[PDB]
Design an enzyme around this catalytic site. Structure first.
Site, PDB file in Angstrom:
ATOM      1  N   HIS B  41       0.801  -1.220   0.000  1.00  0.00           N
ATOM      2  CA  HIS B  41       0.000   0.000   0.000  1.00  0.00           C
ATOM      3  C   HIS B  41       0.840   1.281   0.000  1.00  0.00           C
ATOM      4  O   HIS B  41       0.263   2.359  -0.036  1.00  0.00           O
ATOM      5  CB  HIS B  41      -1.060   0.020   1.107  1.00  0.00           C
ATOM      6  CG  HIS B  41      -0.574   0.261   2.508  1.00  0.00           C
ATOM      7  ND1 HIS B  41      -0.578  -0.748   3.458  1.00  0.00           N
ATOM      8  CD2 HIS B  41      -0.225   1.419   3.112  1.00  0.00           C
ATOM      9  CE1 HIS B  41      -0.205  -0.177   4.595  1.00  0.00           C
ATOM     10  NE2 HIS B  41       0.025   1.123   4.435  1.00  0.00           N
ATOM     11  N   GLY B 143       2.447   6.165  10.240  1.00  0.00           N
ATOM     12  CA  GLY B 143       3.862   6.086   9.883  1.00  0.00           C
ATOM     13  C   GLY B 143       4.531   4.807  10.387  1.00  0.00           C
ATOM     14  O   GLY B 143       5.679   4.527  10.039  1.00  0.00           O
ATOM     15  N   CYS B 145       3.585   1.710   9.676  1.00  0.00           N
ATOM     16  CA  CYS B 145       3.453   0.639   8.682  1.00  0.00           C
ATOM     17  C   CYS B 145       4.815   0.162   8.210  1.00  0.00           C
ATOM     18  O   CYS B 145       5.733   0.975   8.025  1.00  0.00           O
ATOM     19  CB  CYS B 145       2.584   1.092   7.516  1.00  0.00           C
ATOM     20  SG  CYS B 145       0.897   1.568   8.002  1.00  0.00           S
TER      21      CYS B 145
HETATM   22  O1  LIG Z   1      -6.868   7.252   8.758  1.00  0.00           O
HETATM   23  C1  LIG Z   1      -6.620   6.091   8.437  1.00  0.00           C
HETATM   24  C2  LIG Z   1      -6.007   5.762   7.086  1.00  0.00           C
HETATM   25  N1  LIG Z   1      -5.489   4.398   6.970  1.00  0.00           N
HETATM   26  C3  LIG Z   1      -6.171   3.667   5.891  1.00  0.00           C
HETATM   27  C4  LIG Z   1      -5.612   2.279   5.696  1.00  0.00           C
HETATM   28  C5  LIG Z   1      -6.373   1.320   5.032  1.00  0.00           C
HETATM   29  C6  LIG Z   1      -5.865   0.066   4.755  1.00  0.00           C
HETATM   30  C7  LIG Z   1      -4.573  -0.222   5.121  1.00  0.00           C
HETATM   31 CL1  LIG Z   1      -3.909  -1.786   4.748  1.00  0.00          CL
HETATM   32  C8  LIG Z   1      -3.789   0.700   5.788  1.00  0.00           C
HETATM   33  C9  LIG Z   1      -4.312   1.951   6.110  1.00  0.00           C
HETATM   34  C10 LIG Z   1      -3.507   2.928   6.951  1.00  0.00           C
HETATM   35  C11 LIG Z   1      -3.471   2.499   8.419  1.00  0.00           C
HETATM   36  O2  LIG Z   1      -4.356   1.809   8.917  1.00  0.00           O
HETATM   37  N2  LIG Z   1      -2.423   2.997   9.128  1.00  0.00           N
HETATM   38  C12 LIG Z   1      -2.173   2.903  10.524  1.00  0.00           C
HETATM   39  C13 LIG Z   1      -1.511   1.841  11.140  1.00  0.00           C
HETATM   40  N3  LIG Z   1      -1.287   1.715  12.455  1.00  0.00           N
HETATM   41  C14 LIG Z   1      -1.720   2.686  13.239  1.00  0.00           C
HETATM   42  C15 LIG Z   1      -2.410   3.835  12.776  1.00  0.00           C
HETATM   43  C16 LIG Z   1      -2.879   4.856  13.640  1.00  0.00           C
HETATM   44  C17 LIG Z   1      -3.536   5.943  13.139  1.00  0.00           C
HETATM   45  C18 LIG Z   1      -3.769   6.062  11.777  1.00  0.00           C
HETATM   46  C19 LIG Z   1      -3.345   5.095  10.911  1.00  0.00           C
HETATM   47  C20 LIG Z   1      -2.645   3.950  11.377  1.00  0.00           C
HETATM   48  C21 LIG Z   1      -4.035   4.357   6.784  1.00  0.00           C
HETATM   49  N4  LIG Z   1      -6.857   5.011   9.224  1.00  0.00           N
HETATM   50  C22 LIG Z   1      -7.428   4.971  10.517  1.00  0.00           C
HETATM   51  C23 LIG Z   1      -6.899   4.094  11.448  1.00  0.00           C
HETATM   52  C24 LIG Z   1      -7.433   4.047  12.724  1.00  0.00           C
HETATM   53  C25 LIG Z   1      -8.488   4.872  13.086  1.00  0.00           C
HETATM   54  C26 LIG Z   1      -9.032   5.766  12.163  1.00  0.00           C
HETATM   55  N5  LIG Z   1     -10.074   6.649  12.538  1.00  0.00           N
HETATM   56  C27 LIG Z   1     -10.618   7.576  11.533  1.00  0.00           C
HETATM   57  C28 LIG Z   1     -11.929   8.167  12.014  1.00  0.00           C
HETATM   58  O3  LIG Z   1     -11.790   8.785  13.301  1.00  0.00           O
HETATM   59  C29 LIG Z   1     -11.335   7.834  14.272  1.00  0.00           C
HETATM   60  C30 LIG Z   1     -10.000   7.238  13.885  1.00  0.00           C
HETATM   61  C31 LIG Z   1      -8.492   5.790  10.874  1.00  0.00           C
END
Ligand SMILES: O=C(CN1Cc2ccc(Cl)cc2[C@H](C(=O)Nc2cncc3ccccc23)C1)Nc1cccc(N2CCOCC2)c1
Ligand SMILES: O=C(CN1Cc2ccc(Cl)cc2[C@H](C(=O)Nc2cncc3ccccc23)C1)Nc1cccc(N2CCOCC2)c1
Ligand SMILES: [Cl-]
Ligand code: NA
Lengths: 305, 305
Positions: B41, B143, B145
């Site tokens: 990704h 960050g 990942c």
């Molecule tokens: O904003 C995103 C985007 N992601 C999409 C996405 C889709 C598929 C895949 Cl394989 C990866 C990812 C990434 C992803 O999960 N990255 C992350 C990994 N470890 C910790 C993280 C901590 C904070 C953020 C990201 C993190 C990026 N996600 C997100 C994760 C957790 C809560 C929320 N909430 C939004 C709505 O409000 C309440 C919090 C939103």
């Protein structure tokens, strides 16, 4: 999201661990530049440990009585001196893996990572805290003496602890890297005991702020308290007194979450009174006191949920 | 004495961490021999995340679009391919710090160390377990990942996890180093949730044996149970079923403490039905399930790496 007891990556310290041997005793040493630091009790026999005269034992030693092993390499000792309860062995090779480092003496409530070692070989890494009674609740077996505690804020390794002994209650005592013991302990087998321990109040408050940042507010209430009324209640649960310094230190977390420090103090008072009622805070059924305000800010998000 | 949530020393993995940047996305990579492994990704924008055709997105990319930084050194990408949900970037320099390693897929209940990284720079190390629902209760921010999970067996690093995402409940999902997800997750922005989790029964039993070894015996009783009766009770409290394999695995700890596995099962049954009655086990008010029988034996014997 999430909140774990997190240790610093140990690599910079693993590259400093060596094995020190004097006669029949073997323990760990810390090799920095051309010096190996280790507990002075490496020069002791089990009999010497009741009332050892370290000056008298050391004067009988020469450089070639200390065997220092770094991996499968024998280092050559070219000098030796004692500084408080630490022995400093000068060696004829500077450690090519010496990181940027400092020796720091920490205060009770401060946290650090411990790299537990046996025979100069690292076995595990864990996080811990200097208890208010100057002991540490570690995980150490015989041969772990010389294992060190450290922090690595911004690529510089700050060494703060060297392990020396296990007290009768299963807790641990040691020194800073200048050989000064933390607490009223001495490096000898005389009857010694850890004082009654207390909970690190400022750290529990920091951890309650970590829970709010991660989305949990169930424990909050509509009350506030004065600092003196809080301390009167806290002392009844064996909690350390909260000082104006601790209140100032919690300022950034108070501003981030919108919860005043004395408002969080009122929440803590209620939790002490009622318990958790089958609930948890950050995956724990007890009030956690081994995360400092600085650890919470380092680990948690800058954006509250 | 003492029992801590201990991670393996992280040094051999720290020497493999790099930063991978493509477009606006920056995450972590694992540099082994002449290949950098990272989540596929990294080639996605926020828009591409809903329904990504990764082969179609990857075709547009050329070797020079992937910027790989190892410390303050730029690595040259000379090839790229995809294996399941992992991108493999061939580089023109073999990692001189590559340890002896294997890629292993672990099963739920197994534990491993996580070296959390940001911008290719390691920030912390912690121990965690693969939950029965295939998530990990990690501590990760944006960050993180590409951060990896591992175990050390003698001198061999066995990589078992690469971080990909955070679920709405704050728990984490990822893949093995061959890019196969643990659990029914997909690497795309879509409605996904962690399933109902259960407690790792064999690990709670291992931790009760660790408590007995460290001197805590209040929960022991004169009773025993059958494996059949124990599983009927355990299923009622959302505990994983205990198999004859788990009983055989606990054999060494049963022989060391003198407490038969089904005798410890009778203790666990009474703890589930009555609670702890104001008492703790190894400093915990909850039944801890993130230490395996091997972790208990390793920590109570000082095995080094
Ligand atoms: O904003 C995103 C985007 N992601 C999409 C996405 C889709 C598929 C895949 Cl394989 C990866 C990812 C990434 C992803 O999960 N990255 C992350 C990994 N470890 C910790 C993280 C901590 C904070 C953020 C990201 C993190 C990026 N996600 C997100 C994760 C957790 C809560 C929320 N909430 C939004 C709505 O409000 C309440 C919090 C939103
Ligand atoms: O018998 C000794 C010998 N020590 C005296 C002594 C006195 C002064 C100084 Cl400065 C150092 C030391 C050494 C010392 O404390 N070493 C150790 C350090 N960290 C953990 C340890 C875990 C187990 C054993 C040793 C450990 C050596 N100690 C001892 C302390 C507490 C419990 C036990 N055990 C209960 C009985 O079963 C066997 C373990 C044994
Ligand atoms: Cl301090
Ligand atoms: Na029993």
């Amino acid at each position: 999201s999430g909140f774990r007891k997190m240790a610093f990556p140990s690599g910079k310290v693993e590259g400093c661990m060596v094995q020190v041997t004097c006669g029949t005793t073997t323990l760990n040493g810390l090799w920095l530049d051309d010096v190996v630091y280790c507990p002075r009790h490496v020069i002791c026999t089990s009999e010497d440990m009741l009332n050892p005269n370290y000056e008298d034992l050391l004067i009988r030693k020469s450089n070639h009585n200390f065997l220092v092993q770094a991996g499968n390499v024998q280092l050559r000792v070219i000098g030796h001196s004692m500084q408080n309860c630490v022995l400093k062995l000068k060696v004829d090779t500077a450690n090519p893996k010496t990181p940027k480092y400092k020796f720091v003496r920490i205060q009770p409530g401060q946290t650090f990572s411990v790299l537990a070692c046996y025979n100069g070989s690292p076995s595990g890494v864990y996080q811990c805290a200097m208890r208010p009674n100057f002991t540490i609740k570690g995980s150490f077996l015989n041969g772990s003496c010389g294992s060190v505690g450290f922090n690595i804020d911004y690529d510089c390794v700050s060494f703060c602890y060297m392990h020396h002994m296990e007290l009768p209650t299963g807790v641990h005592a040691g020194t800073d890297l200048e050989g000064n013991f933390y607490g009223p302990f001495v490096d000898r087998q005389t009857a010694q005991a850890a004082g009654t321990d207390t909970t690190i109040t400022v750290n529990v408050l920091a951890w309650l702020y970590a829970a709010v940042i991660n989305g949990d507010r169930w424990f909050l209430n509509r009350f506030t308290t004065t600092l003196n009324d809080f301390n009167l209640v806290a002392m009844k649960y064996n909690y350390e007194p909260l000082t104006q310094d601790h209140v100032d230190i919690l300022g950034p977390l108070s501003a981030q979450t919108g919860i005043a420090v004395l408002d969080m103090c009122a929440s803590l008072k209620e939790l002490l009174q009622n318990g958790m009622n089958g609930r948890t805070i950050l995956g724990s059924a007890l009030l956690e006191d081994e995360f400092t305000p600085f650890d919470v800010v380092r680990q948690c998000s800058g954006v509250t949920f």
